[PDB]
C-alpha cells in the first residue's frame, strides 16, 4: 500500500533497508525496531509542538567574562525588521516584543531558520552570544511562528560451556588454527584453540572445544569470539541473546578479514559479502579500613583512566568495594576489578549498584560517564548508570558530545541499549540534535558494514518521529549531496593526475553545474540554520588539489538575509573525513573547556561532514588563505606574513586587531594540536583569514612539537610585548586542558578506536602531552620548552616536506 511507499522513502533517506533479513541469524534487529517504537512515541507525544518547531538554541551556562567586557553599558541592541532597540542582557524575548509594541508574532533571525523565543534571557541564546563574540549586530525579522501542524507525525546448569568447531570455508587464497575466546568487555574469560591444520579452501575439525567456565557463570553481553590464525579473520556471537536465552544450534558465520584494538573487532554483525568472505561453522547445544590501606586505595582511585590496575589493586578495590562506592571517580576502576566470569560476584556487583546514593547525587562528570560507555564495559547495568547521568545534560551539551556518543553505540553489546534510546529521545526532543543525529548515523551507515545494520535501525526509529517537515528537509539534502557527489567523481576521473588544471575541466564543470541546475533550496548539512539556493556557477571551480576537489558556492535562499555573501562548500573524494569530523568536534570541546575559565582562543572548527566512503563536504571559511601560499606570492621569508596582514586590513586599527586575533588564534592551535599530537604540520595545511584568525585544516592521517615558525614569530616581533602574551595565553590554555585530563584522555582513546586505522602505545601520547602526574608549575615549564623548540628548529622541518 501507500504505507509501504513510506518505508521506501525511509530506505532512500537511510541508505540501507532495515526490513531486509538477508544477513541475520536471529531476530535481534527486528526485535529492536519493535522495541524502539515505545520510546519514540513517548517522546513525540510529550514534546511541546511550539518550541519544537521554533527549536530555540539555548544554553543555561553563564555569560563568559570575555563577552561581558563587550557590553560595557548593560545595553544590548536588537535591530527588528526597521528601528534599533535598547535591551537588557536579562530581557526575555516576550518582554522585548511586548516592549516593542508598547501579539503572537515571533522574532526570527535574518537569513536564518533560527528563532529567539522561550522563557530565556537574550543573553542565553547561542545566536546572540555569537553576534557579541564576533562583534555583529543582532538582526531579526518580526515573523509569524511556524505552524506546529507541519511537525505532525505519521502515526504508527553446572556443565562447562562447549563449542563445536566443524570447520572453515573460503573460495579464496601456511597453516591455520581456530581460536575461540569467551570475551566480556575485551576481558578474555577463557580461551581454547584447535589443532593447526593445512590452510585449504575447506578445513573440517569436528571438534568440541571445552571451556573452563560453567554455563550459569556466563554473563549477559558475553561474546564468543572466533578467530583464525595463520590473525586474518574474526567473527563474534553473543552467547546470551536479547531474550536472555542461552544461544544454541547450528551457525554458519561469514567472517571479517584483517588488513595489514578498535571497535570493528567487537561487532556482532556477520560479513554480508557471502560470495568472497571466509566462513565458519559451529554447533551449540547446552568494620572499616586501616589508615595505610585507605591511602593505597585513594592513590589507586586518583590515577588516570589509562593507568593499568594490577591484581593487587583489583583485589583491594573489590574487598573494599563499599568504601570505593563512595567515590564516583572510583567506579570505572572498581567495575574493572569485577570477575564477570563468576555468577556470584556479578550478583554482589548488582546488589552493590542497588544502593548508589553517592553516584546518584554526584554532579554530572562527562569524562567519568564516557569511561563507563567505552569498550571496557559490557555489563548493561553498569552502562545504564552512565546513561543515567547523561539524562541531566542540557541540549547544548548533548550537541557538544553527540558525535562521540553516537560512536559509543559501537561499544554496546546489544542493538537495543540505554545509550541508543537516550540518543533517540534527545534527538526527537530537539530538531538541531535530530538533524546532526541523522548525519552522524548516516555517515556510519554508508561506510561501515560492521555497524550499518544497528545504526540503520536507530536512524529509522528517529525518522519515524522527527515529523513530516524534517523528513522533507532530509530528502532535499540527500538528493542534493547525491547530485553533487556524482559531479565530484566524474570531474576527478577527467583530470587524472599530474595536471594542475585543464581547459576541458573548467568547461565540463560549469557545464554540469548548468545542466544540474535544471533542487530549489536545501538545508546546509553542517549548518542547519542556513538554507542554500541557486548555485553561483561563475564562482564554482576545481581547486587543483591532489584529489581535484570541487569549490562550490551557492546563494542564500532566505530573502530576509541582509548580506549578499555566498555559501561555500568543498566536495572532496579521496580523504577519510570521519577523522576530520572527530578532530573538529574535539576542538569544539576544547573551546567549551576554555570557556569555563573565561578563555577564548578563537579556534575556527569549520563545518565538516562525512557522507560516504572517502567522500564528504567541508565548510568554506570566507576570505581565508594558506600561510604557505602567502609565502609563494612574495617569494622562507619570515617578514611576509605581517606584510600580507597590513595589505588586507585598510585601517591601522584593524591591523592591530588582526595581530590580536592572530596571537590568540595561534596559541589555541598550538596547544590543541600538541595535546592531540597533530601539531607538526606542513605550512600548506595552515590557513589564516584576512582578520588574522589562524587555523589548521585537513586532519586526516596525522621533528617539532607543533608549528610556531619565525614567519609567525615575526608577526609577534622577535622577546616582545605580544610574544609575552603568546607564551602567557598558551600556559593558561594548556593548564586549563589539564584540569579536564580524564575527559580528554577518554575522548582521545575513543576517537582512536572508533575512527582510526590502534594499539595501547598510540593512546599514551596524550597522557604525556598533558603531563599526567605533574605539578602545574612543572607543566607550565614543560610547554614553554616545546615553544623554544619551534624557535631553535626554524624552518628545518618546514623545508623538509618540500621533497
Ligand atoms: N580532508 C581535507 C581536505 C581538504 C581539501 F579541500 F580537499 F583539500 C581540506 C581543505 C579545506 C580548505 N578550507 C577549509 C576552511 O575554509 C576555507 C577552505 N582549504 C583547503 N585548501 C587546499 C588549497 C591549497 O591552497 C586549495 Cl586552494 C586550500 N583544503 C581540508 N581537509
Author numbering: 145 to 225, 230 to 250, 268 to 321, 357 to 373, 379 to 435, 460 to 489, 497 to 522, 545 to 776, ...
Excerpt from the publication:
Phosphoinositide 3-kinases (PI3Ks) promote cell growth, survival, division and motility, and signal through protein kinase B (PKB/Akt) and the mammalian target of rapamycin (mTOR) to control cellular growth and proliferation. BKM120 is a potent PI3K inhibitor, but has been reported to also act as a microtubule-destabilizing agent (MDA). We succeeded in separating the activities of BKM120 as a PI3K inhibitor and an MDA by minimal chemical modification of its core pyrimidine ring.
A 3.2 Å resolution crystal structure of the PI3Kγ catalytic subunit (p110γ) in complex with BKM120 has been previously reported. At this resolution a precise positioning of the BKM120 molecule in the p110γ-binding site is not possible. To validate the rotational orientation of BKM120 in PI3K, the asymmetrically substituted BKM120 derivatives PIKiN1 and PIKiN2, as well as their relevant regioisomers PIKiN1-R1 and PIKiN2-R1, were produced. Interestingly, PIKiN1 and PIKiN2 bound to recombinant p110γ, p110α, p110β and p110δ with a 7–30-fold higher affinity as compared to their regioisomers, which was also confirmed in a p110α activity assay measuring directly PtdIns(3,4,5)P3. To clearly determine the orientation of the substituted morpholino group, a bulky chloromethyl-azetidin-methanol substitution was introduced: here the orientation of the pyrimidine core of PIKiN2 bound to p110γ could be unambiguously determined in a crystal structure resolved to 2.51 Å. Its core pyrimidine C–H group points towards Tyr867 (position U in Fig. 5e and Supplementary Table 8). Closer inspection of the p110γ–PI3KiN2 and p110γ–PI3KiN3 complex structures revealed that (i) the core nitrogen in position V is hydrogen bonded through a structured water molecule to Asn951 and Asp964, and (ii) that the trifluoromethyl-pyridin-2-amine group and aspartates 841, 836, 964 coordinate two additional structured water molecules (best resolved in the PI3KiN3 complex). Molecular dynamics simulations with BKM120 docked into p110γ demonstrated that positioning of the pyrimidine core C–H group towards Tyr867 kept the structured water network intact (CU–H). In contrast, when BKM120 was oriented as in the initially reported structure by Burger and colleagues (CV–H), hydrogen bond interactions between the inhibitor, water molecules, side chains of Asp964 and Asp836 were disrupted.
